[PDB]
A paper describes a structure:
[name] proteins are exemplary mRNA regulators. [name] is a broad regulator of RNAs in [name], binding to >1,000 RNA targets, constituting ∼16% of the transcriptome. The protein scaffold comprises eight α-helical repeats flanked by a short N-terminal sequence and a C-terminal helix (R8′). To understand how [name] accommodates a wide range of target site lengths, we determined crystal structures of the [name] RNA-binding domain bound to RNAs of 9–12 nt, including the recognition sequences in [name] (9 nt, 2.35-Å resolution), MFA2 (10 nt, 2.15-Å resolution), AAT2 (11 nt, 2.5-Å resolution) and AMN1 (12 nt, 2.8-Å resolution) mRNAs (sites of 8 nt did not crystallize).
[name] binds to the 9-nt [name] RNA site by recognizing all but the central fifth base. Bases 1–4 and 6–9 are each recognized by a [name] repeat. However, the fifth base, C5, lies in an atypical conformation, in which the plane of the base is parallel to the axis of the protein, within van der Waals bonding distance of the side chain of Cys381 in repeat 5. The ribose rings of C5 and U6 adopt C2′-endo conformations to accommodate positioning base C5. We refer to this conformation as ‘5-parallel'. Repeat 5 also lacks a large side chain capable of stacking with RNA bases and lies opposite several of the atypical RNA conformations (5-parallel, 5-stacked and triple-stacked). Recognition of the 5′-UGUA and 3′-UA elements by repeats 5–8 and 1–2, respectively, are identical in all structures.
Residue numbers in the entry: 202 to 472, 486 to 534, 557 to 599
RNA sequence: UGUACUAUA
C-alpha cells in the first residue's frame, strides 16, 4: 500500500482496492482531502462504472460508495443510479447493500434520481410481495424508512399499494419492524393516504386490536384528529359488544384506555365538530354502562382494572348530556368503593380508594 | 399490578 502511494493516480486498481478492507479505508481517507479529491474520484468513477452493483453489495466496497456519495457530481451520481435502480430489492435486502442505498437516498440531488429509485421500486422491477418483504426485513425496513423521510409523499405509491393489497396489513402491522415502518409512513402521509390505509386497518381491526404490535397502530390512529368523524364510529360499531373482553387482554387494554381518554379530551375540550362531540358523548355513556355492568370482573381483572381506573379518573373529566353523566358515573363509583375490601390484598386496592375519594371532593 | 424501537469494516 505504501508503494501504491508512490504510484501516480492514473495507474491504480480501484476495484481491487475497494474490495479490500485496508485498500478501501485507504481510498476513503483520500476523498477526505481537498488536495487529491477531484482527481481521485474522476479516475475512481471511470474505473467503476460497470461495477456499481458489485461495489454496493461488496462487504468492503459499500463503504466506498457511501463515502463517494458525499463527493459525487449530480451528473455522476445520476449515472450510478441509472445503473442500479432495477436492483433496489436485492440491494436493500442485502447485509452490505442496504447501507449503500440509504446513503444514496439521503444524498439525492434532484427529482430524476428520486424518480429512478422510485421507478426501481415499482412493479415494473419490484413486486408487491417483495415490497412487503422489504418492509419487514432487518435490512430492508431501514431503506423504506429513508424513502419515507427523504421523499415527498407523492412518491409513496409503491409502499401504499403493498399495504392496502389484500391482508398484508396483518403481515406488516403484526411484525416487529413493519409496525415501526407503518407509523413512520403515517407520520408524514397526506390526509388521503392516511384515510386509504385507515380503511384497511378498520377492515382487519379484530386482528390488529390485540396484537403485541398491531395495538400500537390503532392507538396511533386515535391521535390523528382528522379521523374523528370516521374512526370513532367504526371502532365502537365493531368492538362495543366485547369491550369487557377487550379491556382484560394485555394489549387491547391499552387501546381501550387510549380510547376512553380520547372521548374525555374531546368532550372536555368543547367546554371539534358538534356531531363528533355529540357522538363521543353517546359512546362514552355507552362505555360507562358496560363497565358498570362488568364491575365485579374488571376491578378483579389483572388488566381490566387499569381500564377501569382510567374511566374513573376525575383528573380526566374534572370540567364535568352532562346530567346523565353524573348518574352513570355516580352509580359506577358509588358501588365501586363498595368493593374495595373485596380486593384488600391487591396492589391497586388503595389506588382506587384515592380515586373515589377524589370524586367525592370534586362533587 | 400491564406491551414493541432494529442492521455491514
Amino acid at each position: 500500500m505504501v508503494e501504491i502511494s508512490a504510484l501516480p493516480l492514473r495507474d491504480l486498481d480501484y476495484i481491487k482496492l475497494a474490495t479490500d478492507q485496508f485498500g478501501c479505508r485507504f481510498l476513503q481517507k483520500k476523498l477526505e482531502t481537498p488536495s487529491e479529491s477531484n482527481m481521485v474520484r474522476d479516475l475512481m468513477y471511470e474505473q467503476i462504472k460497470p461495477f456499481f452493483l458489485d461495489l454496493i453489495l461488496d462487504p468492503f466496497g459499500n463503504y466506498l460508495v457511501q463515502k463517494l456519495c458525499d463527493y459525487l457530481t449530480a451528473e455522476q451520481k445520476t449515472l450510478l443510479i441509472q445503473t442500479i435502480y432495477p436492483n433496489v430489492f436485492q440491494i436493500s435486502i442485502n447485509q452490505y447493500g442496504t447501507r449503500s442505498l440509504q446513503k444514496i437516498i439521503d444524498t439525492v440531488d434532484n427529482e430524476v434520481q428520486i424518480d429512478l429509485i422510485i421507478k426501481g421500486f415499482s412493479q415494473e422491477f419490484t413486486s408487491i410481495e417483495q415490497v412487503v418483504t422489504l418492509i419487514n426485513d432487518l435490512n430492508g425496513n431501514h431503506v423504506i424508512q429513508k424513502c419515507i423521510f427523504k421523499f415527498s409523499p407523492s412518491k409513496f405509491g409503491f409502499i401504499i399499494d403493498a399495504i392496502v393489497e389484500q391482508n398484508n396489513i396483518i403481515t406488516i402491522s403484526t411484525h416487529k419492524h413493519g409496525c415501526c415502518v407503518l407509523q413512520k409512513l403515517l407520520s408524514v402521509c397526506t390526509l388521503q393516504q392516511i384515510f386509504k390505509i385507515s380503511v384497511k386497518i378498520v377492515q382487519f381491526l379484530p386482528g390488529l386490536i390485540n396484537d403485541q404490535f398491531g395495538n400500537y397502530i390503532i392507538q396511533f390512529l386515535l391521535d390523528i384528529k382528522e379521523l374523528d368523524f370516521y374512526l370513532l364510529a367504526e371502532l365502537f360499531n365493531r368492538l362495543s359488544n366485547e369491550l369487557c373482553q377487550l379491556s382484560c387482554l394485555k394489549f387491547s387494554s391499552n387501546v381501550v384506555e387510549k380510547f376512553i381518554k380520547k372521548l374525555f379530551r374531546i368532550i372536555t375540550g368543547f367546554i371539534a365538530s358538534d356531531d363528533v362531540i355529540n357522538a363521543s358523548m353517546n359512546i362514552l355513556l355507552t362505555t360507562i354502562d358496560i363497565f358498570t355492568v362488568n364491575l365485579n370482573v374488571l376491578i378483579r381483572d389483572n388488566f381490566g382494572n387499569y381500564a377501569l381506573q382510567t374511566l374513573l379518573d376525575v383528573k380526566n373529566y374534572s370540567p364535568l348530556f352532562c346530567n346523565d353523566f353524573s348518574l352513570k358515573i355516580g352509580n359506577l363509583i358509588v358501588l365501586t368503593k363498595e368493593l374495595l375490601p373485596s380486593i384488600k390484598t391487591t396492589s391497586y386496592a388503595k389506588k382506587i380508594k384515592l380515586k373515589v375519594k377524589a370524586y367525592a371532593e370534586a362533587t
